[PDB]
């Protein structure tokens, strides 16, 4: 039920990053998936390792 | 009071008993020494008790109670087991009415239960 604007704000609060694009789709099973692109000033790999990947 | 004139009703209540009702149902007699010391005929069985089997294949065996499987109406005793095909040893269930209690595990709650069950005057 969330939209793109709230997703962008929530990611910033949880992980302290800045985004340039948010894309969303609804999967065939009913779950919503989001692609979030980070700014060039932030490393996606570094953030992923911080969360634990 | 499960027992009644309606056999269908009595059997339904027994086999659909909740867990706390099942604890009372699986009780065992006390030994002669315990009976003379507490004036109590029987007690419900709990873990870490010591029992002696009086009926069945393991007649005369003694051991410690390792489980009270209320879902299967049995108890598990150490050293009372069987060997599987591959060499694993597994416990064998025994009904609580075929054994007798030799040593009691005592705490504050158990001592209170024994006191309220005592049959003495004054």
């Amino acid at each position: 039920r969330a939209n793109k604007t709230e997703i962008k704000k929530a990611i910033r609060k949880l992980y302290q990053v800045k985004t340039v694009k948010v894309n969303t789709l609804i999967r065939p099973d009913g779950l919503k998936k989001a692609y979030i692109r980070l700014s060039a000033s932030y490393d996606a790999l570094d953030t992923a390792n911080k969360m634990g990947l | 009071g499960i027992k009644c004139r309606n056999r269908r009703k009595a059997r339904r209540a027994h086999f659909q008993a909740p867990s706390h009702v099942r604890r009372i149902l699986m009780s065992a007699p006390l030994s002669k020494e315990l009976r003379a010391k507490y004036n109590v005929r029987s007690m419900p069985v709990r873990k870490d008790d010591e029992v002696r089997v009086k009926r069945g294949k393991f007649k005369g065996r003694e051991g410690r109670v390792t489980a009270c499987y209320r879902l299967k109406w049995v108890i598990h005793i150490d050293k009372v087991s069987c060997e599987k095909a591959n060499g694993t040893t597994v416990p064998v269930g025994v009904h609580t009415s075929n054994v007798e209690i030799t040593k009691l595990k005592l705490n504050t709650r158990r001592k209170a239960i024994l006191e309220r069950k005592d049959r003495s005057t004054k």
Binding site: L14, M51, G52, L53 | -
Partner: protein
């Protein structure tokens, strides 16, 4: 492992910080669940959710007693929210109350005083 007895003394601000803290490990446990960590961590999920539920129970209770105290004043009984009032049934709410069902006229009062019931017995 907060326990209900501990949470009684705390104030609203402390409870919110505790609630905000507890949600973090729940999120961290969920991401670890995708990384198929050992079942020892998977036991912590149930504990955290129970801890969260206890905090929300205390917060809701404290808010409700505040509103009841505020609206306990007379001449505000018409302004009290309906959710804070007694909910017996639809039928019982609209039924005649004790002070109305037993109303009597002046003539009835005098007649009852004149002819009271008696205990007599015979022989």
């Amino acid at each position: 492992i907060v326990k209900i007895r501990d949470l009684k003394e705390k104030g609203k601000d402390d409870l919110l910080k505790q609630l905000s803290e507890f949600k973090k490990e729940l999120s961290q446990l969920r991401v670890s669940q995708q990384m198929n960590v050992g079942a020892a961590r998977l036991g912590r999920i149930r504990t955290i959710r129970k801890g969260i539920a206890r905090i929300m129970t205390v917060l809701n209770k404290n808010e409700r007693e505040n509103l009841r105290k505020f609206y306990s004043d007379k001449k505000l009984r018409s302004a009290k929210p309906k959710t804070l009032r007694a909910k017996l049934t639809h039928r019982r709410r609209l039924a005649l109350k004790a002070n109305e069902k037993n109303r009597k006229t002046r003539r009835q009062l005098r007649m009852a005083h004149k002819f009271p019931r008696r205990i007599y017995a015979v022989k």
